[PDB]
Amino acid sequence: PGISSVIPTVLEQSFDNSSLISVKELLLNKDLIHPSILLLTSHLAHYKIVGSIPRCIAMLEVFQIVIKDYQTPKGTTLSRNLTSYLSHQIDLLKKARPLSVTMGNAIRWLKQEISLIDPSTPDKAAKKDLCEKIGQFAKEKIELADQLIIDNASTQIEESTTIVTYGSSKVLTELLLHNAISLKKNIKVIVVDSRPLFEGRKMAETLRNAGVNVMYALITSLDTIFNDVDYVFLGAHSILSNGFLYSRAGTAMLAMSAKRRNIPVLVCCESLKFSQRVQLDSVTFNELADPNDLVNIDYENPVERRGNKGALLNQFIKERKFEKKKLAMENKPKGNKIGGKKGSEGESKDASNEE
């Protein structure tokens, strides 16, 4: 049937709208669930690597796997309780970690597919062609697009470079790696990290795994960092109806700093990620998570010290809250790199009705 109630720590006062709670440790559920979905949910909940790009891919893969494993019942047709199952899966996902814009898109696509071949077919002929189709789609709208983006970036660099970076943008990692290896330029990389999830550290590790010339710093440590240095790059999650940068955490401040210190910024985007849901603030709907993302005392992740802090529910009058997804200022990031090479983010929905 499921589990509700019993939530950790104080609920504060402001930003009280989104799901942030729940099944972290499992105790009794419904009895026909394929466990791969559950496993994925468990992973996503306690993930410290994922950042917009790969989640959707993973979801797609999972769906493919499900399809491959799918057995059509001896009684009812190929989609009778399948829809119910899907709904349940969605509910589980939401309970674990919210459906992103890419996830929504994927769901839409799935629904479309369901409509396309209506109930009349057997088993090993329909799903044979479905799986292949979906694979082809994946190959098309994703990997090739990424490749295109990479190649656009390749030309975008001219002569002599010194750069500052942020975010677990898989594409950006690929980009920088490409710069390092198969372009052999004078590519300097400076890394900025973040407390909620360690993306910067991962990026640094990846750089090391190539042997890159790397400086490393954080959100605050910037005022000295510019004392030659030109380029700045970011990795957005999604763009709405407005053209505003509805992405992850520590971007906006950095962007502002860059704007102030003379040389502009460039972000990269994908031609599926755009939405018709409309918002202009952080408060409307955000990735909100458990305050356990702020317990550790610096340096690394698994250390656990009995130093000064380590309580929340017993702390009378104390409101410890943090945000994961932000909404960056529209006019600030200049260049955007999508499927049609280059353009101003004043486009907003130029590809939305184009579909």
């Binding site: 975008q156 006019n331 101003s344 004043g346 486009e347 130029d350």
Partner: protein, 302 residues
């Protein structure tokens, strides 16, 4: 046969037909000799010619824009799936036709879209384009009490030339220095611009001092405008605040020389951002807000 030769042909005269149109005409002439039926013998050769032209450029931008537009037009042409002859003929016709169109576009610009200077709104102008001058000369026959302000042009004294073109209409004018550009933003109403191209980013690819002007306009909130015949949407992106496809050096720190030699490599081309066009005057309707980008998208279907 050469496009270069054709380009050379017009210089002393000109001052009438849009450059991008002359280039297009030349291209058409080059084409209609060596059989435009086949797509194997032709398109590749055209591309090669364009590349050659690009290589041969001294300091000119819009040629590329013209040629890509032409290419796009050609591509559009053979979608009717009828026959090779008729379509070819149509294509051939559409070169001189295109040239003819430019004048009509200019006319449209100078009779509908000239209501931006009316109540003696004093005009601070820089960037010599034909369209801007055409509209100003066409508004001199209406006598709407117009006044001109000229920021000095110094690549090699185009300013003098400009001041000589406004003396044939008989209208009070004044010389302005681009160091005292902070000094007078008061009595002059608005800042109007001629240029060399409009970017995929949105902003303007221009001349010897423009970004500063833009900045000052922004500071003063007295709106900043760009006026042209519409076919300068080149596939180019000025991602930085000091980078473009440039003909000369980008700020060349010359060595410790002696008798006043290496100096005058002063930036004769500059650019300002997308949040600067309060309006853009184009013949395809008065459209601006994200218009160029939209057009580009329509062209490349992306």
């Amino acid at each position: 046969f050469n496009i270069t030769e054709t380009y050379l042909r017009f210089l002393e005269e000109d001052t009438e037909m849009t450059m991008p149109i002359a280039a297009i005409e030349a291209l058409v002439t080059l084409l209609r000799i060596k059989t435009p039926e086949t797509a194997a013998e032709m398109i590749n050769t055209i591309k090669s010619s364009t590349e050659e032209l690009i290589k041969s450029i001294p300091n000119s931008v819009s040629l590329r824009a013209g040629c890509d537009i032409f290419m796009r037009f050609v591509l559009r042409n053979l979608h009717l799936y009828g026959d090779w002859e008729n379509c070819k003929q149509h294509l051939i016709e559409n070169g001189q036709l295109f040239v003819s169109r430019a004048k009509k576009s200019r006319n449209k610009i100078a009779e509908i879209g000239v209501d931006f200077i009316a109540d003696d709104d004093i005009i601070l102008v820089h960037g010599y384009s034909r369209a801007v001058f055409s509209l100003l000369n066409h508004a001199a026959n209406k006598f709407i009490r117009f006044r001109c302000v000229v920021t000095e042009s110094r690549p090699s004294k185009q300013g003098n030339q400009l001041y000589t073109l406004l003396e044939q209409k008989g209208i009070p004018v004044t010389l302005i220095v681009d160091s005292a550009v902070g000094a007078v933003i008061d009595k002059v109403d608005k800042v109007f611009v001629g240029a060399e191209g409009v970017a995929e980013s949105g902003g303007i690819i221009n001349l010897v001092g423009t970004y500063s002007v833009g900045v000052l306009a922004h500071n003063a909130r007295k709106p900043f405008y760009v006026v042209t015949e519409s076919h300068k949407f080149v596939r180019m992106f000025p991602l930085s605040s000091d980078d473009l496809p440039m003909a000369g050096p980008p700020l060349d720190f010359t060595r410790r020389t002696d008798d006043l030699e290496d100096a005058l490599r002063g930036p004769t081309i500059d650019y300002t951002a997308q949040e600067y066009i309060t309006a853009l005057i184009t013949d395809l309707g008065v459209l601006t807000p994200s218009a160029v980008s939209e057009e580009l998208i329509k062209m490349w279907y992306d």
